[PDB]
Amino acid sequence: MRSFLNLNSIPNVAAGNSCSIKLPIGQTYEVIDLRYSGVTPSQIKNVRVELDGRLLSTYKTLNDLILENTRHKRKIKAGVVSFHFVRPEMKGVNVTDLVQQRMFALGTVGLTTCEIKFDIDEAAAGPKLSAIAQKSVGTAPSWLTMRRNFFKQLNNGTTEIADLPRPVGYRIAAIHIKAAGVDAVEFQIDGTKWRDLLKKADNDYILEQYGKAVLDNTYTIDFMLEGDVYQSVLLDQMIQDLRLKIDSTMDEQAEIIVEYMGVWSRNGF
């Protein structure tokens, strides 16, 4: 049996303020529903999910969480944005789908602090935020999704990005290139071309082919289209080159979103 709780009131919710959603340790957080009003998702900046003071996932703005859910075609409602720790799209290969989905839940056992920090923009009309938690029996943090932010400049022609962090033992579920002039992209590991120079229209067709929604000004490289976690990129230590070849038509700075995965560690990624 799951428990639906109305989280404690968020302290000091005001424009230009730096607030935090301190989660009580002990149980597992499958989903966290954040209700907002008097402020836009884009006005909720620097969203960070921290476990024991260490960064887990980061969102430039709350709007990126809305887009993250939209991509998987999850239920979107105005005035509310959810933090889906449990991945509903997961499919089991040697275990049930339910087990594969719940494995991403935010367990808090052994944790000292679980927080969701963010800053309220100064222009916020009259910010009002509350949260509801869909919890289950306690478990260790364990397997978690680690959304990381990276900013790289793009040229008009070809741009190569090979300096992406490769935490050993971790995996890469997907890579999102946020740019308005990306025509085609190619992904390779150690010379091996896992993703040919696919045109945007072709890449976007495959995405939609798997029930995903194409995000505006974004080139998504989904490594878990089938929902199989073992299809994701395994950051094996012996890997010598993890490269991305981007064919752009504009000279701009792109925001590269990398969805990492791995067993959460006190001293890990």
Partner 1 sequence: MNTSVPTSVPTNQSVWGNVSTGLDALISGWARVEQIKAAKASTGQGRVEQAMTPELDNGAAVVVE
* Chain positions contacting Ca ion, by CB under 5 A: 105, 107, 142-143
- Identify the residue among 236, 241, 249, 250 touching partner 1 (CB under 8 A): 236
Place of tokens 């997907």: 174
Q: Which phi and psi (to 5°) does residue 58 adopt?
A: -135, 140
- Is there binding between residue 145 and partner 1 (CB under 8 A)? no
Distance of alpha carbon 86 from alpha carbon 152, whole angstroms: 30
- Between residues 59 and 143, which has the closer beta carbon with respect to Ca ion? 143
Does residue number 240 form part of the binding site for partner 1 (CB under 8 A)?
no
Nearer to a copy of itself, 4 or 151 (CB): 4
**Distance between CA atoms of 210 and 1, rounded to whole angstroms?**
31
User: What residues from 206 to 235 belong to the interface with a copy of itself (CB under 8 A)?
Assistant: 206, 208-211, 223, 225-228, 231-234
CB of 234 to partner 1, least distance (A): 4
Round to whole Å and give the CA distance between 219 and 101. 25
Q: Which of 52, 91, 46 is nearest to 65 (CA)?
A: 46
- Choose between 193 and 266: whose C-beta lies nearer to a copy of itself: 193
Q: How many residues bind partner 1 (CB under 8 A)?
A: 44
Query: Is 164 within 8 Å of 149 (Cβ atoms)?
Result: no
In the three-class reduction of DSSP (H, G, I as helix; E, B as strand; rest coil), residue 209 is classed as helix
d(CA 175, CA 77): 25
DSSP annotation of 249 reads S
Rule CB under 8 A: say whether 238 interacts with partner 1.
yes
Give the shortest CB-66-to-Ca ion separation in angstroms.
23
User: How far, in Å, are 1, 112, 201 from residue 175 at the CA level?
Assistant: 35, 31, 17
Nearer to a copy of itself, 10 or 233 (CB): 233
| Nearest to partner 1 of 120, 242 (CB atom) | 242
CB 96 within 8 Å of CB 126: no
Compute the distance between CA of residue 229 and CA of residue 3 in angstroms, rounded to an integer.
Answer: 27
Residues interacting with a copy of itself, by CB under 8 A?
1-6, 31, 33, 35, 74-75, 77, 80, 82, 91-99, 132, 134, 193-198, 202-203, 205-206, 208-211, 223, 225-228, 231-234
Residues interacting with partner 1, by CB under 8 A?
1, 22-27, 92-96, 98-100, 102-103, 108, 110-113, 136-139, 142-143, 169, 171, 190, 192, 228-231, 234-239, 263, 266
